[PDB]
Amino acid sequence: ETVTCLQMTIYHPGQQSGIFKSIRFSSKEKFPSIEVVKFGRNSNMCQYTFQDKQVSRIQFVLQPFKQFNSSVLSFEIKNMSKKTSLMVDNQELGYLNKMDLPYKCMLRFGEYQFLLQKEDGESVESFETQFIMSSRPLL
Amino acid sequence: RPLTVLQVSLYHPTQGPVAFAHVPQQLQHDASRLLVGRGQNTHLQLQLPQLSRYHLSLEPYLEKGSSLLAFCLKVLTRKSCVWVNGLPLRYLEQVPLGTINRISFSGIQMLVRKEGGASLETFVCYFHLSPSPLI
Numbered sequence: 001e002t003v004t005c006l007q008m009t010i011y012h013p014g015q016q017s018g019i020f021k022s023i024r025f026s027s028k029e030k031f032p033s034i035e036v037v038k039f040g041r042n043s044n045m046c047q048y049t050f051q052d053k054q055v056s057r058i059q060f061v062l063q064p065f066k067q068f069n070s071s072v073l074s075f076e077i078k079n080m081s082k083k084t085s086l087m088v089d090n091q092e093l094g095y096l097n098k099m100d101l102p103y104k105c106m107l108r109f110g111e112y113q114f115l116l117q118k119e120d121g122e123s124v125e126s127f128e129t130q131f132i133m134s135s136r137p138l139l
Numbered sequence: 140r141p142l143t144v145l146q147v148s149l150y151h152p153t154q155g156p157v158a159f160a161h162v163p164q165q166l167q168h169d170a171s172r173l174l175v176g177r178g179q180n181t182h183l184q185l186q187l188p189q190l191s192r193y194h195l196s197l198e199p200y201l202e203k204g205s206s207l208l209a210f211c212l213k214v215l216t217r218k219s220c221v222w223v224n225g226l227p228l229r230y231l232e233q234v235p236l237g238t239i240n241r242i243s244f245s246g247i248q249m250l251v252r253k254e255g256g257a258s259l260e261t262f263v264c265y266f267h268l269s270p271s272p273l274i
């Protein structure tokens with residue numbers, strides 16, 4: 001079965017300093033759909049970490065779920081930061097605010113810009129992430 | 140009330156002593172999801188072979204405009220349905236919890252009564268083992 005992929009194109013104006021040095025790019029990573037994927041500074045709490053004192057120890061999390069009467073995998077995004085708002089397009093998520101992720105959207109937190117694009121697949125037990133470099137700003 | 144309290148009652152008709160042997164009197168939890176299942180890495184471990192290692196989760200979150208935590212129950216098992224207030228939920232389906240919640244799964248009956256408190260970072264669950272049916 002094909003696997004749903006969350007393709008995240010990521011940018012930071014200071015990325016040349018090593019902000020994304022722990023991220024493997026253009027390599028799909030598979031997760032069970034009962035896992036929660038976390039992004040942040042603390043590598044004991046987050047599968048994905050940014051080398052940045054500005055980043056909260058957990059910044060945000062992806063929460064896979066299924067709508068009723070639907071066979072595809074949806075994802076909530078939830079802001080875990082008490083200090084830094086998370087922008088999803090023009091929607092601002094405060095602390096512990098969550099929303100369903102659109103199929104294509106721009107995430108902003110601090111100086112970070114993430115273009116997230118969901119490509120549905122048929123597997124219900126797994127999903128994959130994929131990270132893409134951008135030398136120039138997305139926004 | 141400094142913390143939101145979840146008063147949780149549990150019942151099983153025949154396997155109480157083994158199924159609930161690892162249920163603590165209470166659990167104080169943070170803003171991460173609270174996992175329920177038969178696995179050793181769950182926060183509420185229920186020792187029933189019909190359960191999945193990860194069977195369901197309780198997720199605290201905030202609605203826009205809210206000063207009180209909400210709770211999202213999501214089904215994590217592939218094996219069976221979890222009834223929540225009359226809706227039979229299956230894998231990765233979810234609903235928010237109300238004030239009184241009637242939850243049944245694989246023979247376990249569970250009541251969750253939510254009393255709101257001030258904390259947006261911490262909540263506490265108290266667990267009662269009922270000798271008699273709850274639902």
Ligand SMILES: C[C@@H](O)CC[C@@H](C)O
Binds near residue numbers: 069
């Ligand atoms: C018509 C009803 O029984 C089924 C509808 C589809 C969308 O699930």
